[PDB]
Amino acid sequence: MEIRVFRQEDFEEVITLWERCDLLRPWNDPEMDIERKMNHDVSLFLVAEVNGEVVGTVMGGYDGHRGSAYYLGVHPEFRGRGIANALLNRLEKKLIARGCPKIQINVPEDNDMVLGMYERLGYEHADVLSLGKRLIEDEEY
Amino acid sequence: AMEIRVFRQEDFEEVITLWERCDLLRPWNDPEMDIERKMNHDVSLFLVAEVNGEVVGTVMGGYDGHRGSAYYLGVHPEFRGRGIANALLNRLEKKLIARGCPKIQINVPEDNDMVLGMYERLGYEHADVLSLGKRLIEDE
Ligand SMILES: [Zn+2]
Ligand SMILES: [Zn+2]
């Protein structure tokens, strides 16, 4: 396999991958989320392709101060082969390449597993509360 | 005469000074480098608040194509009776909306109830989530 940048043709294949990995939350329209990312900057939005097919994603980003990562998933049939790791290790390097000093990720608290994965890779938990506010509402889909 | 506008190169050392006075600097974040990171990337969400020509508040707003962000929110100790932080976040929020950003997320210290309360009062809600981070470039 091989990690590259998301391109428009990857659009339905990615949604259908997010489907299979249950990354889909009713609040967030994934069509909209991809459109936003496209309008914005696709360059830290990476896909893993095996056999000329997408099997993993990470929507990474950078705001001029912190790196981010959302929509990190790997196809349940492709889960043994270090894909999410290759995917995070490519993002972190693409971030360093543009002077991003730190990346920060939110993980569901009850998910003790994915929590251990990140810690393994040298991520520290911060003693902060994440606070959020909805600015634009996504319809149901 | 208070006015919120976008950060300008001229504001550079005034803002650093304000960050000092606002007890916002940390030895692991070089504020010159952070200002420079931001300028090189996109300065349009990096807001200041000026009162009679003086910069007395900032917010380094941000957007990543999915989520909006805010760092370095400070208002000069002497300019705190006046809704300036509120004005800073309100404008940032409008600016995020203007470019299609659906949501802003801000991390606040688990101790700092005064700040948690401000955000709640502004309509921010707690997410049942844990913040993990990884330093990629050390400032030194
Ligand atoms: Zn396609
Ligand atoms: Zn810790």
Rounded to whole angstroms, the maximal C-alpha distance in chain A is: 42
For chain A, the residue count is 141
Mutate to test the interface with A, among B29, B32, B40, B64 (most CBs of A within 10 A): B64
- What angle do the packed helices A30-40 and A11-20 form, to 10 degrees? 130
CATH architecture of the domain with range B1-124: 3-Layer(aba) Sandwich (3.40)
Q: How far is the CA of B37 from the centre of ligand 2 (A)?
A: 25
Are the C-beta atoms of A121 and B102 separated by less than 8 Å?
Answer: no
Q: Å resolution of this model?
A: 2.0
A2-123: what fold?
Aminopeptidase (3.40.630)
- Label residues B21-41 b or e (16+ Cβ within 10 Å = b): ebebeeeebbbeebbebbeeb
d(CA A90, CA A50): 16
Chain A positions in Cβ-Cβ contact with residue B127 (cut-off 8 Å): 106, 130-132
Instruction: Check CB contact of A133 with chain B, cutoff 8 Å.
Output: yes
Query: Nearest-5° angle of CA B105, CA A117, CA A79?
Result: 110
Instruction: Check CB contact of B88 with chain A, cutoff 8 Å.
Output: no
Closest by CA position to B94, among listed B44, B28, B36: B44
SS3 string, A22-49, reads CCCCCCCCHHHHHHHHHHHCHHHEEEEE
* 3-state secondary structure (DSSP) of residue B100: coil
Indicate which technique resolved this structure.
X-ray
Q: Where are the domains of chain A?
A: 2-123
φ, ψ for residue B28, nearest 5 deg? -90, -5
Structure tokens at B113: 């109830």
d(CA B116, CA B108): 7
H/E element, B97: helix B84-98
Q: How far is A52 from chain B (nearest CA, A)?
A: 26
H/E element, A118: helix A112-120
Task: Calculate the dihedral angle through the C-alpha atoms of B49, B50, B56, B61, rounding to the nearest 10 degrees.
Answer: 20
DSSP 8-class letter at A117: H
